[PDB]
Motif scaffolding. Structure first.
Motif, PDB file in Angstrom:
ATOM      1  N   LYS A   1       0.868  -1.222   0.000  1.00  0.00           N
ATOM      2  CA  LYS A   1       0.000   0.000   0.000  1.00  0.00           C
ATOM      3  C   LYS A   1       0.878   1.236   0.000  1.00  0.00           C
ATOM      4  N   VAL A   2       0.552   2.185  -0.878  1.00  0.00           N
ATOM      5  CA  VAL A   2       1.187   3.503  -0.944  1.00  0.00           C
ATOM      6  C   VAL A   2       0.282   4.511  -0.231  1.00  0.00           C
ATOM      7  N   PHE A   3       0.812   5.110   0.823  1.00  0.00           N
ATOM      8  CA  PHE A   3       0.046   6.080   1.617  1.00  0.00           C
ATOM      9  C   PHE A   3       0.161   7.464   1.020  1.00  0.00           C
ATOM     10  N   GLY A   4      -0.858   8.289   1.299  1.00  0.00           N
ATOM     11  CA  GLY A   4      -0.734   9.728   1.127  1.00  0.00           C
ATOM     12  C   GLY A   4       0.116  10.214   2.294  1.00  0.00           C
ATOM     13  N   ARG A   5       0.724  11.376   2.125  1.00  0.00           N
ATOM     14  CA  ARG A   5       1.456  12.024   3.193  1.00  0.00           C
ATOM     15  C   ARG A   5       0.622  12.140   4.463  1.00  0.00           C
ATOM     16  N   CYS A   6      -0.540  12.793   4.374  1.00  0.00           N
ATOM     17  CA  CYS A   6      -1.396  12.990   5.554  1.00  0.00           C
ATOM     18  C   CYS A   6      -2.064  11.713   6.033  1.00  0.00           C
ATOM     19  N   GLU A   7      -2.310  10.781   5.113  1.00  0.00           N
ATOM     20  CA  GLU A   7      -2.799   9.458   5.513  1.00  0.00           C
ATOM     21  C   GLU A   7      -1.798   8.763   6.425  1.00  0.00           C
ATOM     22  N   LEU A   8      -0.529   8.683   6.015  1.00  0.00           N
ATOM     23  CA  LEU A   8       0.524   8.152   6.891  1.00  0.00           C
ATOM     24  C   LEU A   8       0.686   8.962   8.188  1.00  0.00           C
ATOM     25  N   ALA A   9       0.768  10.287   8.120  1.00  0.00           N
ATOM     26  CA  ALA A   9       0.855  11.088   9.357  1.00  0.00           C
ATOM     27  C   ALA A   9      -0.226  10.693  10.388  1.00  0.00           C
ATOM     28  N   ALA A  10      -1.452  10.562   9.923  1.00  0.00           N
ATOM     29  CA  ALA A  10      -2.566  10.220  10.796  1.00  0.00           C
ATOM     30  C   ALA A  10      -2.484   8.803  11.328  1.00  0.00           C
ATOM     31  N   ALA A  11      -2.108   7.827  10.509  1.00  0.00           N
ATOM     32  CA  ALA A  11      -1.898   6.436  11.021  1.00  0.00           C
ATOM     33  C   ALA A  11      -0.760   6.407  12.044  1.00  0.00           C
ATOM     34  N   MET A  12       0.337   7.124  11.760  1.00  0.00           N
ATOM     35  CA  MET A  12       1.481   7.163  12.674  1.00  0.00           C
ATOM     36  C   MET A  12       1.119   7.841  14.006  1.00  0.00           C
ATOM     37  N   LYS A  13       0.354   8.934  13.937  1.00  0.00           N
ATOM     38  CA  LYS A  13      -0.221   9.601  15.125  1.00  0.00           C
ATOM     39  C   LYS A  13      -1.132   8.651  15.949  1.00  0.00           C
ATOM     40  N   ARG A  14      -2.062   7.975  15.274  1.00  0.00           N
ATOM     41  CA  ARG A  14      -2.909   6.950  15.913  1.00  0.00           C
ATOM     42  C   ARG A  14      -2.062   5.938  16.671  1.00  0.00           C
ATOM     43  N   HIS A  15      -0.962   5.500  16.056  1.00  0.00           N
ATOM     44  CA  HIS A  15      -0.083   4.463  16.647  1.00  0.00           C
ATOM     45  C   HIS A  15       0.949   4.942  17.620  1.00  0.00           C
ATOM     46  N   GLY A  16       0.879   6.208  18.027  1.00  0.00           N
ATOM     47  CA  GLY A  16       1.702   6.757  19.134  1.00  0.00           C
ATOM     48  C   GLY A  16       3.071   7.337  18.777  1.00  0.00           C
ATOM     49  N   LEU A  17       3.295   7.673  17.514  1.00  0.00           N
ATOM     50  CA  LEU A  17       4.612   8.130  17.116  1.00  0.00           C
ATOM     51  C   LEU A  17       4.806   9.632  17.211  1.00  0.00           C
ATOM     52  N   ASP A  18       3.716  10.409  17.288  1.00  0.00           N
ATOM     53  CA  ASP A  18       3.858  11.866  17.463  1.00  0.00           C
ATOM     54  C   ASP A  18       4.522  12.155  18.800  1.00  0.00           C
ATOM     55  N   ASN A  19       5.740  12.663  18.729  1.00  0.00           N
ATOM     56  CA  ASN A  19       6.590  12.885  19.864  1.00  0.00           C
ATOM     57  C   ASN A  19       7.091  11.697  20.643  1.00  0.00           C
ATOM     58  N   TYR A  20       7.174  10.553  20.005  1.00  0.00           N
ATOM     59  CA  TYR A  20       7.693   9.417  20.701  1.00  0.00           C
ATOM     60  C   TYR A  20       9.186   9.672  20.891  1.00  0.00           C
ATOM     61  N   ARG A  21       9.635   9.684  22.140  1.00  0.00           N
ATOM     62  CA  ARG A  21      11.024  10.045  22.521  1.00  0.00           C
ATOM     63  C   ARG A  21      11.427  11.443  22.088  1.00  0.00           C
ATOM     64  N   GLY A  22      10.449  12.329  21.928  1.00  0.00           N
ATOM     65  CA  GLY A  22      10.708  13.694  21.518  1.00  0.00           C
ATOM     66  C   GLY A  22      10.737  13.912  20.014  1.00  0.00           C
ATOM     67  N   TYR A  23      10.514  12.856  19.227  1.00  0.00           N
ATOM     68  CA  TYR A  23      10.519  13.011  17.761  1.00  0.00           C
ATOM     69  C   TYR A  23       9.110  13.333  17.277  1.00  0.00           C
ATOM     70  N   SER A  24       8.863  14.614  16.995  1.00  0.00           N
ATOM     71  CA  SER A  24       7.561  15.038  16.475  1.00  0.00           C
ATOM     72  C   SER A  24       7.190  14.253  15.216  1.00  0.00           C
ATOM     73  N   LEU A  25       5.895  14.256  14.926  1.00  0.00           N
ATOM     74  CA  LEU A  25       5.326  13.470  13.852  1.00  0.00           C
ATOM     75  C   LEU A  25       5.999  13.714  12.519  1.00  0.00           C
ATOM     76  N   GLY A  26       6.305  14.973  12.226  1.00  0.00           N
ATOM     77  CA  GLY A  26       6.933  15.323  10.979  1.00  0.00           C
ATOM     78  C   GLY A  26       8.233  14.592  10.757  1.00  0.00           C
ATOM     79  N   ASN A  27       8.927  14.218  11.825  1.00  0.00           N
ATOM     80  CA  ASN A  27      10.165  13.421  11.672  1.00  0.00           C
ATOM     81  C   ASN A  27       9.994  12.032  11.090  1.00  0.00           C
ATOM     82  N   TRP A  28       8.998  11.347  11.596  1.00  0.00           N
ATOM     83  CA  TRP A  28       8.517  10.016  11.124  1.00  0.00           C
ATOM     84  C   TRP A  28       7.959  10.036   9.704  1.00  0.00           C
TER      85      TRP A  28
END
Length: 129
Positions: A1-28
């Motif tokens: 599956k090929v994600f959209g940029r914002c589609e991936l951002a939102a899945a990654m946010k859902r899965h706890g990666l926004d600021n995980y260890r201080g790495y904001s979502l945009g990093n992921w």
């Protein structure tokens, strides 16, 4: 599956990666972009003969078992093929172990060389999160 940029951002946010260890979502999202161009099926062979798998190009030298990487570990305790599912769960889980391993996201050479020291929050710009 090929994600959209914002589609991936939102899945990654859902899965706890926004600021995980201080790495904001945009990093992921920036890492995924330059590892796999947002494609869960991406595979690439390393020089040492390991292979990288999935949205974040997680490598069989340490993190997963691909049945073909001599003198390697499986610290995420999964088949590398699980990293290629349209469901990004195993990729996310395994990246949280990776990014806690002491080098942070420097573990991803592409993050270090492409995302580190940039305006990474540009990768979640305009996204409904």
């Amino acid at each position: 599956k090929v994600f959209g940029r914002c589609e991936l951002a939102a899945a990654m946010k859902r899965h706890g990666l926004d600021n995980y260890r201080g790495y904001s979502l945009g990093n992921w999202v920036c890492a995924a972009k330059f590892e796999s161009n947002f494609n869960t099926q991406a595979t690439n062979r390393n020089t040492d003969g390991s292979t990288d798998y999935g949205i974040l190009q997680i490598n069989s030298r340490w993190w997963c078992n691909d049945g073909r990487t001599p003198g390697s570990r499986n610290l995420c305790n999964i088949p590398c093929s699980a990293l290629l599912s349209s469901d990004i769960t195993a990729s996310v889980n395994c990246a949280k172990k990776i990014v806690s391993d002491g080098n942070g996201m420097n573990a991803w050479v592409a993050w270090r060389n492409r995302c580190k020291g940039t305006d990474v929050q540009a990768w979640i710009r305009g996204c409904r999160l």
